[PDB]
């Protein structure tokens, strides 16, 4: 009953174009071991061949088109792609595909266009008077032609850039002069406006942009049969174009498409906005949580566990928060590296996995490791911790968030889950022991460790209450098996 996704992808995955096969392939092991979602990676044609897909060319060319130097994506061709999502289906794991609609990469020309440099600490102030620059703002994919879409892209269809290519200066902002030419509103408010990101910024403004990325959307679901989605970059589009958009989608297919949206600020107030604001139609990754794991892995112990969960989505919006411990973004290396460090990352799993709130996900990094920057699979201390919230998580929950280094919860199953109920127990720390109620029913049963960390058996007294041990710097999870 309890759903977990996974990101299917990392960074540094080598571009052999066989990742597609390995999805296809790996289907049904997933399933058997808890995984109900998969978040893809984006699977249409980048930049290059080898670009992981955020820096979007072409959103109608799924591997299929010879265009960038390439037919298949960094991952595959559109034949492996969508023999994989069959497997998946046919495994009944549900698909969500990647959606980059901030702006688009990898343009087919240039243009001249008029426009006036912003400052990029705070884009709604113009720093230079209006002048003409040379930006990449054409697509007219010459693979592709007009299949599946003759919609072709002008300047006029963009906001602006940050690169001008007849004077190549560095750190500009360039903001497109126009009829109705502004940066859109409403976007987070960082440096001013946050609209800009990267690349040739699309402009939700234009009429033309917003029917034409609405019917990509109805196409990309209906080529894929997607289940649903995770949105890329939404602190930096128009907040009502994205609301909207989902509706539109949701609307045009008949079906209730899951939606996870991508707000990347350690700011719930910033996320609470964006969740009213898109009148709370779809979820959002919990940031401020990764940021909590990642500093208490960071603080050796120091960290007071119990305010783990302060500041959270999961904690104030529960049923809008899809919680996870790392990412593409996140991982050694990359843009906002702040990796959770290994000893913590089990903590950190249960900490997701084995709570009633929350729609939890699991980093194809951390599963499978991440082989170029020495991070091993991780999936022997995972497995245990998805097999406890596949079978055991269930329930009334039990808190016990009351000490600095050891903190744990109970779940006091249901019927609809046979032996199912759970104690989970972590320390930042020192080990030891806590009492915690999992239910009188459960009075006599010989509980274990599902997790091997602890060897032992805990006996669930007569009142309910089994006196559960952890190890340093670890987490047990007693179940009764
Ligand atoms: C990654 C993350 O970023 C954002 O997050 C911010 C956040 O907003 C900010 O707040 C802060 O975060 C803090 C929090 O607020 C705090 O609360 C917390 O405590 O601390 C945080 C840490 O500070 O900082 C964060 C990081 O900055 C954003 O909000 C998140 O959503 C975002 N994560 C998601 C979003 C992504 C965007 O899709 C995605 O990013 C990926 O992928 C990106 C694309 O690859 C990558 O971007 C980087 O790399 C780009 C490519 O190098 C670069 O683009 C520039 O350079 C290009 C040239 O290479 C330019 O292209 C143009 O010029 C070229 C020349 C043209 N090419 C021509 C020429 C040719 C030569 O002959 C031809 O061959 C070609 O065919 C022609 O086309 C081209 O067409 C032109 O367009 C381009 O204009 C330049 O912009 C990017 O600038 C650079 O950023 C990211 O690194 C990577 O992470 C995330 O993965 C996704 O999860
Ligand atoms: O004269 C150039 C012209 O370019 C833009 O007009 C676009 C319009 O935005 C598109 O929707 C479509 O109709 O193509 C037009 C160009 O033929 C500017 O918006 C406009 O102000 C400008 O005059
Ligand atoms: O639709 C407006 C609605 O917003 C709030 O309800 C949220 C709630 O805060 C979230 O935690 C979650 O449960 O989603 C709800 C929206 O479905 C307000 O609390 C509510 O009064 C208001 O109608
Ligand atoms: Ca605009
Ligand atoms: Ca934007
Ligand atoms: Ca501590
Ligand atoms: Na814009």
Redesign the pocket.
């Known amino acids: 009953t309890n759903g977990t996704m996974m990101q299917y992808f990392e960074w540094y995955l080598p571009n052999d174009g066989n990742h597609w096969n390995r999805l296809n392939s790996d289907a049904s092991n997933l399933k058997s071991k808890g995984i109900t979602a998969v978040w893809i990676p984006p699977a249409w044609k980048g930049?290059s061949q080898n670009?992981?897909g955020?820096?979007?060319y072409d959103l109608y060319d799924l591997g299929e088109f010879n265009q960038?130097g390439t037919v298949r994506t960094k991952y595959g061709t559109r034949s492996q792609l969508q023999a994989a999502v069959t497997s998946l289906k046919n495994n009944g794991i549900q698909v969500y595909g990647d959606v980059?609609m901030?702006?688009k990469?990898?343009?087919?020309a240039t243009e001249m266009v008029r426009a006036v440099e912003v400052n990029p600490n705070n884009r709604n102030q113009e720093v230079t008077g209006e002048y003409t620059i040379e930006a990449?703002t054409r697509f007219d994919f010459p693979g592709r032609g007009n299949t599946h879409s003759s919609f072709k892209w002008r300047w006029y269809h963009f906001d602006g850039?940050?690169?001008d290519?007849s004077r190549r200066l560095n750190n500009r902002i360039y903001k497109f002069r126009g009829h109705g030419k502004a940066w859109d509103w409403e976007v987070?408010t960082?440096n001013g406006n946050?609209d800009y990101?990267?690349?040739?910024d699309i402009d939700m403004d234009h009429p033309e942009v917003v029917n034409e990325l609405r019917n990509w959307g109805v196409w990309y679901t209906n080529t894929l049969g997607l289940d649903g989605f995770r949105i890329?970059?939404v602190?930096?589009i128009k907040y009502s174009f994205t609301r909207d958009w989902i509706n539109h989608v949701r609307s045009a297919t008949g079906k209730n498409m899951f939606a996870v949206a991508?707000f990347?600020?350690?700011?719930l107030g910033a996320i609470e906005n964006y969740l009213q604001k898109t009148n709370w139609n779809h979820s959002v990754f919990d940031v401020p949580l990764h940021?909590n794991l990642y500093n208490a892995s960071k603080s050796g112990g120091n960290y007071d566990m119990r305010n783990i969960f302060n500041g959270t989505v999961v904690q104030r919006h529960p049923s809008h928060a899809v919680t996870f411990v790392d990412?593409?973004?996140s991982q050694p290396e990359?843009?906002?590296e702040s990796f959770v460090e290994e000893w913590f990352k089990p903590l950190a799993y249960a900490l997701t996995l084995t709570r009633e709130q929350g729609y939890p996900s699991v980093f194809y990094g951390d599963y499978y490791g991440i082989p170029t920057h020495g991070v091993p699979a991780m999936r022997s201390k995972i497995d245990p911790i998805l097999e406890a919230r596949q079978k055991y998580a269930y329930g009334k929950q039990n808190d016990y968030l009351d000490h600095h280094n050891i903190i744990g919860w109970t779940r006091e199953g249901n019927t609809a889950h046979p032996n199912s109920g759970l104690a989970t127990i972590m320390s930042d720390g020192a080990g030891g022991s806590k009492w915690m109620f999992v239910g009188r029913n459960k009075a006599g049963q010989v509980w274990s460790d599902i997790t091997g960390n602890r060897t032992g058996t805990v006996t669930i007294n007569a009142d309910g209450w089994g006196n559960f041990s952890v190890n340093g710097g670890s987490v047990s999870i007693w179940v009764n098996k």
């Open positions: 930049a670009d992981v955020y820096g979007a960038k980059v901030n702006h990469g990898g343009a087919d990449w850039v940050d690169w290519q987070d960082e946050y990101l990267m690349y040739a890329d970059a602190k930096h991508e990347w600020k350690n700011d940021y990412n593409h973004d990359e843009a906002l």
